[PDB]
């Protein structure tokens, strides 16, 4: 279910500085390219090792594409103050997400093209890659301008064409890399947390991708009662972390057992305190 996305953001802030434009591209949810109008030398930059295989011609051109995207966002950003009759005093955000999903047959599985203004859905190209969905009065105007302009039809091209032609190409150069993983390292920590009850916290660290499941089972019957969890979070080195806890009667801690499910494992982890 490989995929590629390009997250674009343009934020305008109170001041003399022209708005800032940032663009981040992904391949299977992995960042591989980036562009920040704030960089000393604005240019798209490699973000994945497998991208270093591309030559200058690739970067010069994409950076020129970013430059344009920037004016586009800049101009659009301007038009929005208009549709919304907003006072030229403050800051606003305009986001875009586009890209394409690739089926098993290397065929375009689906395309995406949607924008959000102030973090809320604005305009969006429907799955038929033919029609639009505007979210409020303002977007109706954009929608029309585009239907009349014949825009949908030109994004469809990209989604069905270039987005695919390259995504596969990228996957090609970075299959080894993208395909890699880092199993989790786990262990349980004891914790006072009561005078009769104790807290067991099963830790999973250094794993990648971020997907993972952690269970707590007392002789068979997995537990869900008094079980805590935490949003999976970045360690700051590429991998991720996560833990789950369960309230357990004292002098019984060793009865409960924790298991850790991850694709990196050749077999799920099974440990206790």
């Amino acid at each position: 279910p490989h995929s590629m996305r390009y997250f674009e953001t343009a934020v305008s802030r109170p001041g003399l500085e022209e708005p800032r434009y940032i663009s981040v591209g992904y391949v299977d949810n992995k960042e591989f390219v980036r562009f920040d109008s704030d960089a000393e030398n604005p240019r798209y930059e490699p973000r994945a090792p497998w991208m270093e295989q591309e030559g200058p011609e690739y970067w010069e051109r994409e950076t020129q594409k970013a430059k344009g995207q920037e004016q586009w966002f800049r101009v659009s950003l301007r038009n929005l103050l208009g549709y919304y009759n907003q006072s030229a005093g403050g800051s606003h955000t305009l986001q875009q997400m586009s890209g394409c999903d690739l089926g098993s047959d290397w065929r375009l599985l689906r395309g995406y093209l949607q924008f959000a203004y102030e973090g809320r859905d604005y305009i969006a190209l429907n799955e038929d890659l033919k029609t639009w969905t505007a979210a409020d009065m303002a977007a109706q105007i954009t929608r029309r301008k585009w239907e009349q302009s014949g825009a949908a039809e030109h994004y469809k091209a990209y989604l069905e064409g270039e987005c695919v032609e390259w995504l596969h190409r990228y996957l090609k150069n970075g299959n080894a890399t993208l395909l890699r993983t880092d199993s989790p390292k786990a262990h349980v920590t004891h914790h006072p947390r009561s005078k009769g009850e104790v807290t067991l916290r099963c830790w999973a660290l250094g794993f990648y991708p971020a997907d993972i499941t952690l269970t707590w089972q007392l002789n068979g019957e997995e537990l869900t009662q008094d079980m805590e969890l935490v949003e999976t979070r970045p360690a700051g080195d590429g991998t991720f972390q996560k833990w789950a806890s369960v309230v357990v009667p004292l002098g019984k801690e060793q009865n409960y057992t924790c298991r850790v499910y991850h694709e990196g494992l050749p077999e799920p982890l099974t440990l206790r305190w």
């Binding site: 594409k65 659009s76 586009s98 093209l113 585009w146």
Partner: peptide, 9 residues
């Protein structure tokens, strides 16, 4: 490779 927007909003 990145999309290239067409008509502005």
């Amino acid at each position: 490779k990145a999309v290239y927007n067409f008509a502005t909003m």
